Write a protein that binds this DNA or RNA. Structure first.
Ligand SMILES: Cc1cn([C@H]2C[C@H](O)[C@@H](COP(=O)(O)OP(=O)(O)OP(=O)(O)O)O2)c(=O)[nH]c1=O
Ligand SMILES: OC[C@H]1O[C@@](CO)(O[C@H]2O[C@H](CO)[C@@H](O)[C@H](O)[C@H]2O)[C@@H](O)[C@@H]1O
Ligand SMILES: [Mg+2]
Length: 580
DNA sequence: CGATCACGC
DNA sequence: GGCGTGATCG
């Protein structure tokens, strides 16, 4: 069965043809500054394996990699591009990324290696990466003969699969989504990840010191009030202390026992002194374990930067995710956690952090897609949509919607369109099921086009087998025709939500591409650091801030044209905290 | 490795 | 209600 190839000792001219499938293998999951273990090239002239020490120290190979006119087809080009950047080598000319192609054709497939993508087209002449490298503790690069055969088979699969994938993308009207949106975005994400974000490590260490002390204090107080020691970090052990020893009322249950969630503890606070201590301990512990220790573990000691990886081929709706570290979930809502953001600083002296965010983008997207006259008029008047909803469902004037009311209208605005029930909304708003049913009815009376959207998009999903977003991303929903009610219900909620969340994802991706082009045209030093779903974070010289204040919102506001305006709020400052 | 919890959008 | 990461338990 073996596949024929040349195990080359030196780079030859026929390896540098103007179209090739290229594999630049990085086996460590986190590819930042990781080793490249081998290279395979498949082109019109044959199949080749190259040792990295050789190829990457060859001026002609290096020049070929960087020549935009020499076209390469790859799988996970970002991984290769970033690992090359760490070696001071530029990769250009990537015209097809099989990972991004498979992701667009069906995100549910969970494609995370060439073999899985190949399976989508009945191509099985390549092994899964896990079969070759093993997993976890057993993980390891095999001897050269086995490694080279594997890389060549992956390159040969990419070579064969480009056309069928591109054909199906075209049938799906996703060809531009790949070539004009996702692939250009991949390069931008590569730059952002490689740039990293600088952190004030001394500040983090200091916070960590103060957290460890307070943690020790609250822990003893807790054991003192409980009349005993227990593992506070065990919801089960906690439940026993709270509901069996101290006999606090059981306000909520989970599947396997008593709930001890923050919301429940908040309701129990009045009942006993131990409760406030538990919340405090949990708050401190989250900051310490997840954020302080997590960030300090991954900061690069030479530059003080952290380098996330944006997974561009994971979420079912077309969002990015962020890992190791996750820079999309740094605290902000509560001041204590928000202080962590003080430790995220500009990479150079006399630079500043600039943050821009798409105010209520999901509801603006809903207004556009549903063509609800009331929702559209509200955004055209630049009303605060949560206050306007508060006004409609509670039947009050603007002047009398309290902050608590706005927070509630938020819950209604987030929940209804995404398929919340009367039961769940009642839980959310701490009112009766019947009370919540009345608000939902009033909501649909106020926003009838939204009701019509929910009905129509579910009907369409049932008819076509999938739902789509503004720029033609798709999500298949086979469960929407399940004879099982609960299973089907989940699918109906996905049908209503995906087009909204996914269109918002399309828009910000396009804005990132538009933004980078404008920044380059203007020769600004400003560059992107992070995306957090509906916001973009940049750093730049202080001397560029006035230009950015006009440029960034304009670019983001103009990324797409909807039936209502896109609104962008922006702030800058000396740290991410201050960009508020 | 599923549950629970807590953080973001 | 939707989409994520990850700490921690058992
Ligand atoms: C906080 C929160 C956000 N989200 C999603 C939907 C939100 O529109 C999006 C952004 O969060 P928010 O910025 O809090 O929502 P918003 O922009 O609509 O309202 P506000 O003017 O008060 O900022 O995150 C939820 O789905 N559930 C939630 O509880
Ligand atoms: O390089 C990211 C890219 O690779 C995949 C697997 O093909 O994910 C791998 O890398 C991630 C980033 O380090 C890890 O979180 C993940 O566990 C690992 O499998 C794709 O999922 C991703 O798009
Ligand atoms: Mg907002």
């Amino acid at each position: 069965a073996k596949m024929a190839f040349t195990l080359a000792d030196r780079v030859t001219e026929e390896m540098l043809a103007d179209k090739a499938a290229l594999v630049v293998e990085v086996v460590e999951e986190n590819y930042h500054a990781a080793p490249i273990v081998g290279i395979a090239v498949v082109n019109e002239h044959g199949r080749f394996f190259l040792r990295p020490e050789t190829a990457l120290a060859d001026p002609q190979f290096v020049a070929w990699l960087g020549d935009e006119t020499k076209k390469k087809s790859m799988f996970d080009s970002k991984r290769a591009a970033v690992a090359l950047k760490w070696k001071g080598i530029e990769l250009c000319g990537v015209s097809f990324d099989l990972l991004l192609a498979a992701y667009l054709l069906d995100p549910a497939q969970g494609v995370d290696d060439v073999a899985a993508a190949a399976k989508m087209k009945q191509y099985e002449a390549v092994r899964p990466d896990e079969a070759v490298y093993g997993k976890g503790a057993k993980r390891a690069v095999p001897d050269e003969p086995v490694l080279a055969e594997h890389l060549v088979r992956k390159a040969a699969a990419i070579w064969e699969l480009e056309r069928p994938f591109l054909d199906e993308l075209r049938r799906n009207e996703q060809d531009r989504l790949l070539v004009e949106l996702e692939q250009p975005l991949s390069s931008i994400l590569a730059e952002m990840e490689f740039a990293g974000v600088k952190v004030d490590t001394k500040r983090l260490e200091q916070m960590g010191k103060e957290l460890a002390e307070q943690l020790g204090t609250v822990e003893q107080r807790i054991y003192e009030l409980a009349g005993q020691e227990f593992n506070i970090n065990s919801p089960k052990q906690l439940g026993v202390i709270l509901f069996e020893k101290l006999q606090l009322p059981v306000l909520k249950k989970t599947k396997t026992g008593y709930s001890t969630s923050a919301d429940v503890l908040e309701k129990l606070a009045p009942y006993h002194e131990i409760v406030e201590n538990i919340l405090h301990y949990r708050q401190l512990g989250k900051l310490q374990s997840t954020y302080i220790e997590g960030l300090l573990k991954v900061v690069r000691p030479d530059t003080k930067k952290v380098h996330t990886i944006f997974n561009q081929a994971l979420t079912q709706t077309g969002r990015l995710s962020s890992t190791e570290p996750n820079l999309q979930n740094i605290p902000i809502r509560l001041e204590e956690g928000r202080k962590i953001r003080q430790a995220f600083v500009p990479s150079e002296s006399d630079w500043l952090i600039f943050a821009a965010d798409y105010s209520q983008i999901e509801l603006r997207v809903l207004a556009h897609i549903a063509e609800d006259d009331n929702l559209m008029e509200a955004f055209r008047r630049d009303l605060d949509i949560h206050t306007k909803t508060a006004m409609d469902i509670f039947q009050v004037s603007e002047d009398e919607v309290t902050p608590n009311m706005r927070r509630q209208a938020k819950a209604v605005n987030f929940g209804i369109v995404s398929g919340i029930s009367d039961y769940g909304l009642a839980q959310n708003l701490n009112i009766s099921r019947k009370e919540a049913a009345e608000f939902i009815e009033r909501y649909f009376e106020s926003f009838p086009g939204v009701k019509r959207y929910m009905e129509n998009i579910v009907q369409e999903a049932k008819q076509k087998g999938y739902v789509t977003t503004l720029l033609h991303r798709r999500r298949y929903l086979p469960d929407i025709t399940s004879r099982n009610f609960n299973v089907r219900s989940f699918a109906e909620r996905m049908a209503m939500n995906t087009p909204i969340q996914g269109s918002a994802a399309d828009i910000i991706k396009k804005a990132m591409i538009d933004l980078n082009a404008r920044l380059k045209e203007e020769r600004l030093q400003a560059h992107l650091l992070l995306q957090v779903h509906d916001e973009l974070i940049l750093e730049a010289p202080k001397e560029e801030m006035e230009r950015l204040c006009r440029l960034v919102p304009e670019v983001m506001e103009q990324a797409v044209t909807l039936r209502v305006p896109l609104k962008v709020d922006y702030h800058y400052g000396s740290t991410w905290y201050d960009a508020k």
